């Protein structure tokens, strides 16, 4: 009986979490911060551009100037934007296109709840824009992931209560944002990274409408 699905983008719809990681690691190393490895990057997944940069700068003893802070965020974004120019429909993760088609057939709303300002560009790259009933603008919320605001806004944008929605996420921060919104999270990734307390699937082929119904029917929510 859920009425909406609230999609993260990066690491859910396609493998762009890998590109954010590579770009943040390159930035960090340029400023002599070598701690952005895959384990540290689990604290960056789902986190805004500025919050990501500050989590990396927290690894250093000294502060950068406000001018350098702004430059660094822009530097990373310009690199990332170059990395994603060749993304195509062939890069949609397994299961995702068919899930979008099945949700529309079943009159279940589809909304994007990505913290990325590059979200709309990436949905166009992948020929997915037409499936979305709404895209929650991440610059409109007052509080970014792990705050629930973006999931609350995604649900509102398609006229469904968060409590009647499922959220799909690959990150610690986004799973917390889903929990605090009222929606039911189903994570994608390693249990070791995302927790043993919610439903986690190992890859996105598991994100079928059949499975979302299976999970919803057992407590949920
Ligand atoms: P999700 O994974 O919330 O689709 O995206 C998150 O977006 C932020 C901000 O991206 P931007 O605006 O393109 O710089 C990234 O820092 C996170 O890595 C990403 O998970
Ligand atoms: Mg993500």
The values of phi and psi at residue 35, to 5°, are: -85, 0
Catalytic residue among 8, 51, 180, 196: 8
CB atoms within 10 A of CB 58: 10
* Integer Cα distance of 21 and 72 in angstroms: 15
125 lines ligand 1 (CB under 6 A): no
CATH of domain 15-92: 1.10.150.240
Domain boundaries, the chain: 1-14+93-221, 15-92
Q: Is 196 annotated as catalytic?
A: no
Overall fold of domain 1-14+93-221: Rossmann fold (3.40.50)
For the record, the structure tokens of 99 come out as 């899930």
Closest CA to 201 of 172, 177, 164, 169: 169
Rounded CA Rg of the chain: 17
Q: What is the dihedral of CA 61, 65, 68, 73, to 10 degrees?
A: 70
Sign of CA pseudo-dihedral 91, 131, 190, 78 = positive
* Integer Cα distance of 194 and 17 in angstroms: 15
Kindly identify the ligand whose nearest atom is closest to the C-alpha of 7. 1
């Amino acid at each position: 009986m859920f009425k909406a699905v609230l999609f993260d983008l990066d690491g859910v719809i396609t493998d762009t979490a890998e590109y954010h990681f590579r770009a943040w690691k390159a930035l960090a190393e340029e400023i002599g911060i070598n701690g952005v490895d895959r384990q540290f990057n689990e604290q960056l997944k789902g986190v805004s551009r500025e919050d990501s940069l500050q989590k990396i700068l927290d690894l250093a003893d000294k502060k950068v100037s406000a001018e350098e802070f702004k430059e660094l965020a822009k530097r990373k974004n310009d690199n990332y934007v170059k990395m994603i120019q060749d993304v195509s429909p062939a890069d949609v993760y397994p299961g995702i296109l068919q899930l979008l088609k099945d949700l529309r057939s079943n009159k279940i709303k589809i909304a994007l709840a990505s913290a990325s300002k590059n979200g709309p560009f990436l949905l166009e790259r992948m020929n997915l824009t037409g499936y979305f009933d709404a895209i929650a603008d991440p610059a409109e919320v007052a509080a970014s992931k792990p705050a629930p605001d973006i999931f609350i806004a995604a649900a509102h944008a398609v006229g469904v209560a968060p409590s009647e929605s499922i959220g799909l996420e690959d990150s610690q921060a986004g799973i917390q944002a889903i929990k605090d919104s009222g929606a039911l999270p189903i994570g994608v990734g390693r249990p070791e990274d995302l927790g043993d307390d919610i439903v986690i699937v190992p890859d996105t082929s598991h994100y079928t409408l059949e499975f979302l119904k299976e999970v919803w029917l057992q407590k949920q929510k």
